[model samples]
Target: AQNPNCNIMIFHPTKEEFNDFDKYIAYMESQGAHRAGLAKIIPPKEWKARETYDNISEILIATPLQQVASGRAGVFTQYHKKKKAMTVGEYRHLANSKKYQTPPHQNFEDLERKYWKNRIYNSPIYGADISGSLFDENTKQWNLGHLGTIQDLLEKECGVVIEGVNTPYLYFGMWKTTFAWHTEDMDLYSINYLHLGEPKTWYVVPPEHGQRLERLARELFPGSSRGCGAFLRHKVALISPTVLKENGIPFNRITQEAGEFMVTFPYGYHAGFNHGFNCAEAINFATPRWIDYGKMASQCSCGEARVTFSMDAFVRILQPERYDLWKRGQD
Candidate 1:
């Protein structure tokens, strides 16, 4: 068994690195985006923080969901969807109702622990698909610019299209708000860009150890379903790196800073916590190399079985295009 610790790599993208976009794409592909490593892209200035994200609660209050209510945040559990968790507005109202305030003497560790223990649901940082939204269109454009070069080109050339792949889904996190341990739906790759605020701590289990971790999780909690029971609870158990290390499970710990991008490869089991209040945008994408993993994930039951990319669909769309190209070459 290869060491999982060697799988994760973090790099600061230089001008030379960004200059040749294909080189960057090829490097990521060589990292075995399917079976190995978490890649963190720390670009110097692609994303800039305009203001501190401390006013996120206020932003949610102002943003309208529909006609339902004016000042409420949509709360969702880390695991399966059940009933409503609670709106951000209600959570804020409760805080005011209880007159909750941080103790002056509280340390960072204790404060973080307290926040996670009593936090409400994780809210979306921004609306769905902010491609042309009013808020700082340049930032959105710049963020997409990096991914578009590769993903867009691949889709145009190969006819490998992933439907409903929404990028830049901003997530607002306070103390204990968590995204539990799971892979991206359909074994796709994801880029989580931290726009601003406190750092996010990530725990990554390489694909090789994913099954072993699932078995250990079932042992830890009997009567739960296989391969999906470890961290699917409403209240996610904070699994420390030391614990995983003792179990001989290979994993990596990364504290993602503002203006940094965390890339999770296909089938990588990842989970993370926000140190304090922070905002991040995440989007899913696929390249031609993702075809094999897509097929396997379409059949797997560990995560959602719904197919994100269909080979048959790809062929239907691509064969004609390829034929046209061949005809041009023949001419």
Candidate 2:
């Protein structure tokens, strides 16, 4: 209902059509869906029931979630220095307590003013690494980061799992549980699958707008003398969509629901919050084109932040393989 023109391209593909992740995304990419930055895919009903997660309350990870004292809107510390934690069950308890959520009767502005003040603890982001048992076989094959897919040329070549890049991470979110705006490591493509529960709303700025936005971010959240590029990687700011739109940046919105996939393109920036309690899994992947972009990202100095993978290592390793294209594209 908010940000009326912020709608993104949504696709509903049959289970059969969605089978080949490469061809499916490639087909969609050609249709200009890639330009939108975030692709919201709604698979057929049958596929939805297949990889459903029955366990939410059982799993527990005492995570050091950061608190947001400087308001949830605008440029503020996303993962603030002030830290508190909650396990999956404990968090769900807080979420369902009817105490931490937006009281139904108030306007959005009024709620934002009184939001985190009432709560004793406000640690929104809660994620745990689950590379092995993150998703079922059927559902996983659709993942671009998963080994079997064509988009997963990195791991097959490098023979190493880069957590948060190739390996999966499970996240639990309640109202205002925000994952701040960030581009994936080395500007890689990311695919996030919501296993179940309430919808998670995402705000994306396409790759085209990303360049200008980064410049603005450098100005808005200046970091160390080493490099201004660190502004994007710090995970501190959560700029509002309205502000972005005002600055002539194109912003798109997506509310990913149960059994939905939100795929982000290389270099595109994304951030979001959950409607209520929900579970989501995400991993980053790379296509052949990512070879150059990944290389470029490797060299971009971002202050104290370290890159997840070495580009030279991955490329030098991938050199022996993909011979024809590699050779022809070489010169």
Candidate 3:
């Protein structure tokens, strides 16, 4: 493919194969990916009594409150508004303690339920991930539209194709929150990109080092919800170590660029967060290929619950009738 820039190659088809490569390119150029979704003013109700799904209730689910409050900018506003008064080292010291280690004590279980319920009521109707099958009523689902638009642009403009299934990506923005260390259900690749604001520190744990974390989560967070055997088993999280240091464990940080920063998070416990108030804004783009439900979960798993939302469009377009292949007969 001879374009003005570099030597780009089109594997699917030649210039003629596409209906109108130039015209298509022009159309794509006119499109813009959407920003983060609006905040859910109220939480979901089903989460009130914790009677919804035993599985969800078993896990300690918390909102990336800092991220949510910061919106897509993630502390960038705070930095500018407040002046970069806090140095990264100072912030890191605080994040390294137990202060940022645990979830908020604000009775989020009830608040999250209300937040999700309100979001669902006012949310746009989408066929995928909208039925709240995988999420509890309080868990807010990310906006698929923004994700979809980004996927479309990437595919049309760069000839990139997002894989279908088990590819989890960040949906919304949040501020100084620590996503207690954890790993994914399967082996995967993640592209954590900075959408807005300053830089962030992302940490990774090799699959080999994961056992210690698994044991820690199992004993501390207990039941299915709070332990490694349940949620922190295989997948690692991208979080700020400063957020975890209140308990005396120091976390590592990986400086990130503004755009796409490709990193592999082997099956293990990992997490990360912004450097400061407005230092980082990121999206966790994951593609799962080696995850087996029987192995990841001790009980039966909802296969559909694991797929990535952005990949759905690609799956449908590439395999028009592939919806039939879904375990639940619903794509």
Best by TM-score: 2
Superposed Cα RMSD, model 3:
18.5
Residues 1-331 of candidate 3: C-alpha lDDT, one tens digit per residue: 1222211111222323233322433232233100000000111222221233223222111222222122122111111111122323344344444543222435433333233222212111101111122222442222211222334443554476755433223322222433335443333223333433333444544343445445544544444433322444322222223323433332233444343232333353455443322222123332222223112322112242344554455434433454445324323
**TM-score per candidate:** 0.62, 0.76, 0.35
In candidate 2, position 30 carries an lDDT of 65
RMSD of 1: 9.7
Q: Please, what is the whole-model Cα lDDT of each candidate in the order they appear?
A: 0.51, 0.62, 0.31
Clashes per model (N, Cα, C within 3 A) = 4, 0, 53
Question: Using lDDT as the measure, what is the rank order of every candidate, best first?
Answer: 2, 1, 3
- Give the per-residue lDDT of model 2 (tens digit) for 200-262: 778888776777677666656655223543456656566676667767878777678877888
Give the lowest summed-lDDT range of ten residues in model 1: 64-73
Q: Write the per-residue lDDT of candidate 1 for residues 1-331, one digit (tens) a residue.
A: 3322456676666655755544675676565543454678777554353434444453342231211111112122323222233444443443233233233336555644454444443332212222321125444322543455334644676666544334445564544445556676546677777776667778788876777666655555444445343233222333445456667777876678777878887778787666644557776666666555554551232333233233234323444434343233323
Model 2 segments beyond 4 Å from truth? 1-7, 49-52, 69-72, 80-87, 105-125, 128-134, 138-152, 155-165, 223-228, 298-303, 306-331
What is the RMSD, in Å, between candidate 2 and the native fold over all Cα? 7.1
